[PDB]
Amino acid sequence: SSPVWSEPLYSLRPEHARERLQDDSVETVTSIEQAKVEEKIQEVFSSYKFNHLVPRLVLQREKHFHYLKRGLRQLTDAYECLDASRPWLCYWILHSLELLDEPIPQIVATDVCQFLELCQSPEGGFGGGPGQYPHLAPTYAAVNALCIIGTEEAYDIINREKLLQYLYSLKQPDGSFLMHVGGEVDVRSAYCAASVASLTNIITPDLFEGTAEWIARCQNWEGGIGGVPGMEAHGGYTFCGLAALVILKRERSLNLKSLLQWVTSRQMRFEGGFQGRCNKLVDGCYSFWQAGLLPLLHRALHAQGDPALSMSHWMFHQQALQEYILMCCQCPAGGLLDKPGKSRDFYHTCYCLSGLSIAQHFGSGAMLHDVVLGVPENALQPTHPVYNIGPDKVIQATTYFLQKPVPGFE
Amino acid sequence: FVSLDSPSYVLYRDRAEWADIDPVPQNDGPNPVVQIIYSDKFRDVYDYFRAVLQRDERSERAFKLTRDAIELNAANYTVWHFRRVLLKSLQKDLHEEMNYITAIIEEQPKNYQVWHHRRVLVEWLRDPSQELEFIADILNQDAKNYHAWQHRQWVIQEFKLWDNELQYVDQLLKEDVRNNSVWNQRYFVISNTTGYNDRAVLEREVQYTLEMIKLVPHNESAWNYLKGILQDRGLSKYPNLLNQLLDLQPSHSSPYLIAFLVDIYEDMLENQCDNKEDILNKALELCEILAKEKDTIRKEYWRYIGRSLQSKHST
Ligand SMILES: Cn1cncc1[C@@](N)(c1ccc(Cl)cc1)c1ccc2c(c1)c(-c1cccc(Cl)c1)cc(=O)n2C
Ligand SMILES: CC(C)=CCC/C(C)=C/CC/C(C)=C/COP(=O)(O)OP(=O)(O)O
Ligand SMILES: OC[C@H]1O[C@@](CO)(O[C@H]2O[C@H](CO)[C@@H](O)[C@H](O)[C@H]2O)[C@@H](O)[C@@H]1O
Ligand SMILES: [Zn+2]
C-alpha cells in the first residue's frame, strides 16, 4: 500500500486534469467565471503535492477553536450587518464547537441561555436581538443552540405555548408559512417551523396541513426544489424542503428519483465541492446544504425498501468533498469559508464543518462506515442530517419535550 | 433630509426635535455573548428606534428615522415592518416610496427584506407598470440574482404579463446560453401559457434545445431542460430522440449525453420495451463507463443505478 505518512488524493490524480471545464470554444460570463475558479483551485491542489509525496491533510482544529471561542463573546462593528441575526451567531458557533468536540464552559452555556431568553418575544418565537420582532430564522437558530447546550435550564427557556401560537400566526391557507409577521414566503419557513415544532413537541394535526403539498409544488423540472413554486432549484431551498418533509414523514410526496439525480449532479467534477445551482460556482457551505441531502434521500429510499442502496457510502463522492473542504476552505488564521480568496465568517465555518462531518460518517441501521481523510484527529463528531446538531442532542431534546404536553392540545 | 454619511449629519441624541423622547438602550444582559461593539452612529440611531418602537409613535420623525436605521442594517426586518406600519398610518405617497425602494435594491440586490418591501408596495398600489423594466436593470448587473427572478415570476403571474417574457428569455439565452436561471424562466413561461401538451410547442422546444446542445455540447443547463420537458411523459416515449443522440455519441460522448442514454434505457426497461436483455446490458455498460471513466465524481450514484436496474429488470 502506502506508508502511513503519505495518502494519495483523488483531486491529485493525473486523470483529474481531464475534469477541467470544456467550454466548447464558446465563452460566456458563466464559463469565464467557472474557469477562473478552477484555475485557482488547481493551484491550491498542486501545493499539497510534492511529486509522489502527499502528506496527510490536516483540519486546523485549534485555530478554528480560537476563532470560534473569541466570536462567541465579542465582535467588532464589522458585524453590524448581523445585528438582526445574533441567535444565528450563537448557533453557528456552538455547533462548530460541538462538531470539533470542544466543551462549552458552564458559564458560557448559562450566558448564552440568558441572552437567548432576552431574544425571545412575548408573542412567541425568537427575534434577531433583544426587543426585535420574532422571525423563523432566528427562532430556528435559538432552538438549535439551546438544544446543543442541552441542559434543563436551556430547554426551559423556550415558551412552548407562545411558540405554537406564533407558528399558527404565520401559517397560510396554501400550506406555506411567512418568515415573520407581514414577512416574505419561501421554503425556509416550512423547515424552520417543522424543525422547532418537532424538537419541542408542539406539532398539532392541523399545524402542517397542506405544507407537504406546497413543498412538493416547489420541486421543479430540474428535480431540485426552489424557494417558491416555479423558481429555480437551489441547494439551500432543497435542503429545507426535503428536511421538512422528512420531519412530516411525507418525503414520498416528491419525485425522489429526479431529486437524487439533481443533487448528485451538483457536485463539481473538478473542485470536488458542491455548487448551489446548475452553472453557478462551488461553495463550501453547500458541503452541508447539498451533500446533506444524500443522508436524507438514503433514509427516504431505505424506508421504501430500496434493495439497491449502499450499506457503506452516501451517494456522492465523500473523499472528493473532504479534499475540497480541507485544502480549499480553511483560513490559515482559523475559521472556514466559501472558496479560496474569500474571507472567513461563522456561517461558512459552521456549514463547512457540518458537511465535512457528513462526508466522514455513513450510518444506516446497524451499519456504520467511516471515511476520515487525512490525520485521524480530523474526525469530527457526527451531526443529525435533519436538524444539523449532534444526534445525541436531538435524542435528548425530543425525549425531554415529549414528556410535556402539546400546548393546549390533547 | 440628511444622510448617515452627509457632512452635516447630526446624531439623534443631539437633535432638538428629538429632545422630548428618551433613547432606549439595548439590554444584552450582564454577561453578553456575540456582542457587537457598535459604532457611535449605529447605536445612536437604534437607541432612538427602540424608543419610538416601544412607544409605538406613528410620526413623520419616526418615519425618517427608519430610513437611517435601514441604511445602517438593511437586513433588520423589524425596522422594515415598522416603516410599513408608518407608511399606512401617515398615508405616505407610495409612488415616492417606490422610488426609494428602487434605489435601495440597486444598492443591495441580494437582500430578502428590500424585495419583500417592493412586493408589498406593488400589491398596495396594484401597479406593476415599472416592474419588468426595473428587474431587467437589476438582471443586467447580475443575470442570475435569485430574488430578482423570483420577484419577476410573481409580477408576471399576479398581473398576467406573459406577452413578452419568452422574447426576454431568448435575448438572455443569446447573451449567456449557460444561464440556468433563464432556462428555468423558459419552462415557467411555457408551462403557464401554451403548456407542453401541444405537440407543436414540444417539438419546437426539443428542436431549440437540441440546437443549443449542438452549439455548446458541455452546457449542462440545455441537457437538463431537454430531460425536464420529456421526463413526465417518459423518455422512452420519444423513440427518435434515442437514435439522434446515438448518432452524436461518437462525436459528442460527453458525460451528459451518456447519462441521458442511461435515463432513456431506464425508462424503456420500466415500460416493457422489446429486447429487455439487450437494453439492460447496454445500460449497465454505460453505468460502468460513467462510474469508472466519464463521470467518476458520481461513481456512487452510477453504481446505485446499476444495482437498481438489476433489481428491477434482471428477471
Ligand atoms: C447564498 N450564500 C451562499 N453562501 C453564503 C450565502 C449567503 N449569501 C446566504 C444568503 C442567504 C441565506 Cl438564507 C443563506 C446564505 C450569505 C453570504 C455571506 C454571509 C451570510 C450569508 C450570513 C448569513 C446571515 C444570516 C442568515 C444566514 Cl443563513 C447567513 C452571515 C455571514 O456572516 N456571511 C458572511
Ligand atoms: C435553514 C436555512 C435558512 C437555509 C438557507 C439555505 C440557503 C443557503 C439559501 C440560499 C438562497 C439564496 C437566495 C441564494 C442566492 O445567493 P447566491 O446568488 O449568492 O447563490 P449561489 O451563486 O451559490 O447560487
Ligand atoms: O422533478 C420533476 C418532478 O417534480 C414534480 C413535483 O414533485 O413537478 C415539478 O416538475 C414538473 C416538470 O417535470 C412541473 O410541471 C411541475 O410544475 C413541478 O412542480 C413532479 O410531478 C415531477 O415528476
Ligand atoms: Zn456559501
Q: What is the CATH number of the domain that holds B112?
A: 1.25.40.120
**Collapsing DSSP states into helix, strand and coil, what is residue B132?**
helix
Asked if A184 lies within 8 A of B112 by C-beta distance, the reply is yes
Contacts of A290 (CB under 8 A, 6+ apart): A235, A238, A239, A263, A266, A267, A274, A275, A276
A·B CB contacts under 8 A: 220
CA distance B304 to A243: 22
Domain that holds residue B104: 1-315
Q: In terms of Cα–Cα distance, which of B288, B290, B246 is closest to B264?
A: B246
HSE-up of residue A162 (Cα within 13 Å, Cβ side): 13
Lining residues, ligand 1, CB within 6 Å: A 82, 85, 88, 236, 283, 285, 338, 345-347
Task: Calculate helix-pair angle for A293-303, A235-248, nearest 10 degrees.
Answer: 30
Min distance B157 CA to chain A CA atoms (Å)? 10
Using what technique was this structure determined? X-ray
Among the options A95, A348, A361, A393, which is catalytic?
Answer: A348
Amino acid identity, position B53: L
Name the amino acid, one letter, at A199.
Answer: L
Q: Can you list the positions of beta strands (E) in chain B? A: 35-36
What is the resolution in angstroms? 2.1
Q: Which residues of B touch A261 (CB under 8 A)?
A: 263, 301
Domain count for chain A, please give it. 1
Q: Cα dist. B277→B272, B305, B313 in Å?
A: 11, 16, 8
> Does residue A280 carry a catalytic annotation?
yes
Ligand 3, residues at Cβ distance < 6 Å: A 216-217, 219-221, 223, 254-255, 258; B 191, 228, 231-232
Residue B72 DSSP code: H
Question: Which residues on adjacent β-strands are paired with residue B204?
Answer: none
Q: How far apart are CA A179 and CA A160, in angstroms?
A: 18
Ligand nearest to the CA of A283: 4
Nearest to B77 among A31, A130, A135 (CB): A135
Q: Which domain holds residue A21?
A: 1-410
C-alpha cell at B109: 440586490
Q: Fill in the DSSP letter of residue A80.
A: G
C-alpha cell of residue B290: 460513467
Contact B301 A89 (CB under 8 A): no
Which one, of B116, B108, B125, lies nearest residue B80 by Cα?
B116
Answer yes or no: do B150 and A227 touch at CB < 8 A.
Answer: yes
Q: Which residue of chain B is at minimal alpha-carbon distance from A74?
A: B35
- In the structure grid, which three cell numbers stand for residue B308, read together? 437498481
CA-based R_g, chain B, Å: 28
| C-alpha to C-alpha distances, A364 to A296, A310, A370, B223, nearest whole angstrom | 11, 9, 12, 33
DSSP A74: E
Which position among A166, A283, A329, A347 bears the catalytic label?
Answer: A283
The minimum-distance atom of ligand 3 relative to the CA of A224 is 1
Give the ligand with the smallest distance to the CA of B34: 1
Chain A: residue whose CA lies nearest to B30: A111
Decide: A211 and A202 in contact? Cβ < 8 Å: no
> CA-to-CA distance for A409 and B42, rounded, in angstroms?
44
Instruction: Give the length of chain A.
Output: 410
Alpha helix stretches (DSSP H) within A266-382? 286-289, 293-303, 318-328, 346-360
**A28–B176 C-beta distance less than 8 A:** yes
- Chain B residues closer than 8 Å to A234 by CB: 146
B144:A280 CB<8 A: yes
Continuous segment of H or E residues that includes residue A362: strand A361-364
Query: Percent helix, strand, coil in chain B (nearest 5)?
Result: 70, 0, 30
Q: Report CB contact under 8 Å: B36, A77.
A: yes
Nearest bound ligand to CA A345? 1
CATH of the domain at A111: 1.50.10.20
Q: Which of A111, A128, A133 sits opposite B31 (nearest CB)?
A: A111
d(CA A212, CA A216): 6
Enumerate helices (H) and strands (E) in chain A, giving the number of each: 16, 3
Beta carbons of A308 and B36 less than 8 Å apart = no
In angstroms, the separation between the Cα of residue A410 and the nearest Cα of chain B is 35
Spell out the residues 6+ positions from residue A384 whose beta carbon is closer than 8 angstroms to its own: A390, A391, A393, A394
Cβ contacts of residue B11 below 8 Å, gap of 6+? B40, B41, B44
Q: How far apart are CA A382 and CA A372, in angstroms?
A: 12
Q: Which of A347, A349, A351, A352 to mutate to test the pocket of ligand 1 (most atoms within 8 A of CB)?
A: A347
Exposed e or buried b per residue across B175-201, where buried means at least 16 C-beta atoms within 10 angstroms of its C-beta: ebbbbbbbbbbbbbbbeeebebeeeee
The residue nearest atom 3 of ligand 3, judged by CA position, is: A255
Which one of B111, B146, B179, B180 would you pick to mutate in the ligand 2 pocket, going by the greatest count of ligand atoms within 8 A of its CB?
B146
Pocket test of ligand 3: the residue of A215, A218, A220, A250 to mutate, having most ligand atoms within 8 Å of its CB, is: A220
- As for how many domains chain B has, the answer is 1
Residues of B in contact with A274 (CB under 8 A): none
Distance A347 CA to ligand 1 centre (A): 7
Give the nearest chain B residue to A29 (CA atoms): B176
In angstroms, the CA A282 to CA A365 distance is 32
Cell numbers found for residue A77 = 462593528
Burial bucket for residue A348 (CB in 10 Å: 0-12, 13-18, 19+): buried
Is the CB of residue A241 less than 8 Å from the CB of residue A213? no
